[PDB]
Amino acid sequence: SMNKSIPVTQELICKAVLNPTNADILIETKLVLSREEEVWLFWRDSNKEIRSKSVRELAQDAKEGQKEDRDVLSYYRYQL
Incomplete structure (x- = not known):
């Protein structure tokens, strides 16, 4: 809520x-x-295969213009 919790829905989403x-x-x-x-991070692509990659590698790929790297970083930030 506005800088609060109202933990009733919070525990629903936590359990879910x-x-x-x-x-x-x-x-x-x-x-x-x-x-x-x-620091390494792991995720599974659409075809259901596990991938690993270093965070600095992700940063340099983003600076190099990789669209999948953009997607991975955005998903990671939103997850955080």
Whole structure:
């Protein structure tokens, strides 16, 4: 609501969005560290294949003009 919660609908959406968390990857992005350290992210394309790519690689591809990279970054920001 206007800078508030009204948690009744909040707990509905919280319970609901965790059912497609069991079926997690809509293209929902998961964050895993390198374990040298770097941040990698995982998502599944339309043809249902898992893809991985570094965040800096995404940044440089966006600066290079990749439409799928644009889509992935926009989806990631909106998910955040």
